[PDB]
């Protein structure tokens, strides 16, 4: 099966580096771009960067040119990441990824803790949490600051992250399920509102939810919707 494998926690000194790596299988590496992602609780997910293994070509995300490196060694299947320069700003998850729909494949992401003890487009996010009755409806919208459409089509996704697992895709385009998501889920919306609806909400659906635009460079995400179940 195709995995990106990622180390769980580095914890590193302010002003050090860091390299982490995103080891692949299953696949071939030469072919497919891979891409870099930051969380943090606040800020949800930002696109740090991409590379195309196969020729080591990378773009970056303006906000990210100083801080990241993006590297691949094809003789190990391996993607690299160095941030450096570390702050306190830095401390987050940061995944590898395929990012779009249809080669959707998500590393569990690399914590890395900093510690001393001493025009893009935005999309926003309504609720951003939210906690649902078994068998409730949830209702989550996202709001883009410009359109996300061309040709008819919305280039616009719904990632989903269950609590202690990697983000996956669970809607793309707007509107389709991705395979193997349950029927309950569906998505609505175009231009610049989207609308995902759960009905009816069972156990397995807490998690977080993020939207995501990839019409225009950087791809840009919401900051995340955390659903709960409201326990009765
Ligand atoms: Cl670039
Ligand atoms: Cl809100
Ligand atoms: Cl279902
Ligand atoms: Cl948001
Ligand atoms: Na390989
Ligand atoms: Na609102």
């Known amino acids: 099966q195709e995995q990106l494998q990622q180390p769980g926690t580095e914890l590193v000194k302010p002003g050090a580096s860091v390299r982490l790596s995103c080891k692949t299988s299953?696949?071939?590496?030469?072919?497919?771009?891979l891409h870099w992602v930051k969380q943090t609780p606040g800020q949800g997910l930002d696109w740090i960067g991409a590379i195309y293994p196969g020729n080591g070509d990378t773009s970056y995300n303006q906000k990210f040119k100083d801080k990241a490196t993006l590297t691949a060694d094809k003789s190990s299947s391996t993607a690299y990441m160095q941030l450096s320069n570390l702050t306190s700003e830095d401390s987050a998850v940061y995944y590898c990824a395929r990012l779009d729909w249809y080669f959707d494949l998500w590393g569990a992401g690399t914590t890395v803790t900093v510690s001393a003890a001493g025009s893009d487009i935005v999309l926003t996010q309504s609720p951003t949490s939210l906690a649902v009755s078994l068998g409730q409806r949830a209702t989550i919208s996202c709001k883009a600051s410009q359109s996300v459409d061309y040709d008819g089509d919305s280039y616009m996704n719904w990632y989903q992250q269950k609590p202690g697992q990697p983000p996956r895709l669970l809607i793309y385009?707007?509107?389709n399920l991705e395979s193997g998501i349950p029927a309950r889920f569906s998505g609505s919306g175009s231009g610049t509102d989207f609308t995902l609806n759960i009905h009816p909400v069972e156990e397995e659906d807490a998690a977080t939810y993020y939207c995501?635009?990839?019409?225009?460079?950087?791809?840009?995400f919401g900051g995340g919707t955390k659903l709960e179940i409201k326990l009765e």
């Open positions: 995501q635009q990839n019409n225009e460079d950087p791809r840009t």
């Open positions: 299953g696949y071939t590496f030469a072919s497919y771009t």
């Open positions: 385009a707007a509107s």
